[PDB]
Amino acid sequence: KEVCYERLGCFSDDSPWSGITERPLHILPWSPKDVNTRFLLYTNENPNNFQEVAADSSSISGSNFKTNRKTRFIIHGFIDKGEENWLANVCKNLFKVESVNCICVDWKGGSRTGYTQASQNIRIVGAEVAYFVEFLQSAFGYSPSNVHVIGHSLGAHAAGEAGRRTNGTIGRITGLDPAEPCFQGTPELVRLDPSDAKFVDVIHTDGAPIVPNLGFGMSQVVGHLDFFPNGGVEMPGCKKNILSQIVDIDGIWEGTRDFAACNHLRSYKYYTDSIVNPDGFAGFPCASYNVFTANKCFPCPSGGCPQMGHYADRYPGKTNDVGQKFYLDTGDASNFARWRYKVSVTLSGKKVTGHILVSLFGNKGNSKQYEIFKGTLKPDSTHSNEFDSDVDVGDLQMVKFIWYNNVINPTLPRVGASKIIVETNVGKQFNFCSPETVREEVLLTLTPC
């Protein structure tokens, strides 16, 4: 079956669009009129009020659209609308670091329906965006390489549909937790894949199987750089109890959305923070996430680590290969930025049983005490551990060792750290020394050596 539309072309229910294991139903997308894709523009000139534009010279012309700066489109997913605060919330953070034409793509006319129908409606939206991009090219000589499309869930695939139609000439697409159902395992024609854009980077935050786990996003690797923060399955701060998720620091509405799909929504929450935290999301190349947490993928390789999020395009080898997997941990609440360190403590003093903690002091500040090890603390033995600090301390000037245990020995033992080596993510090492020992719960201050 085939239905054709002016401006957008034809749409058919031929394989693989329908009639396959992942998409059996023969559904055709709704009419352009019904989906009603709207382009809402925000700019540094107009940061709080959107100018609704469209693919026509009078619109672009009458509006704040400046042809000399990048253009970033943001496409939402199922049930949402382009007026959702999270979308404009991204532009506003972009205005903090660059001059840009921020375009929110609304298609609630087609997203607030049955999912199988929303999945098909995705192709009209992609079509609408490629039409708008080709228009900017023809009308203003504007290059689609200045174009960046960000898409959340279903929008990740609408962004991939918009790239198919422009033959991968668009600068980049960022898939924020691409929806899984009706897309995972299917052909590239039907979903986001590295070929839709000159560069495609993806943030995976809810990759558990849709059944039975109900993970809304895909585990399958779909871009050039695929990031799996926190492992990409369960996000910290998500599993709070019901009353706490709903009554969270951002109001009921945010809380409710999070009660419904916390992990899934973490992808745009992460991306928004990276914008204003350019080094806060170093992702590490690694076999898998278990090898990462096993302390086997540190520090960054030569040339560096890609920053997950906004600055991922600054990475030198971004398109060297497709589906490159990176891992990293974030915070459980806003300012999700974390800086990973590694410390190696060599023990001194008496053999005891307890937990050893360390805190870092540098030019930019100090951190919390992080547990490095717990169990038998035997002398001259060395223990290492990597951890994600909520602060960047800069150049290290001091490290304070400390231990304790639930059972206090009647001998009053003293444990020390003869040497502690801190190694930063870019591979910088600082050495600290101490000949002293301390009773439990007393900070042992180590100095540069």
Place this chain on the structure above:
Amino acid sequence: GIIINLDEGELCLNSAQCKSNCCQHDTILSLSRCALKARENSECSAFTLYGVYYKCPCERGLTCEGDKSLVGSITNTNFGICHNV
């Protein structure tokens, strides 16, 4: 409420419920959730009897230095900064 071993950001009525022993809230008329104890050189509060804090007590081996008053105790305002010794 009546639920122990809570995580940071989870609502609480009393510090006993929080893994980090600090149920905290910024103002008097506002909900309190579990928060991490104050790291060195940042603001803290002297251990209290009210169960919740406006600022958290310091981490291990640290002393919250500041003016400790009789009024400050009944008012839960015995503020200071976390210092090594």
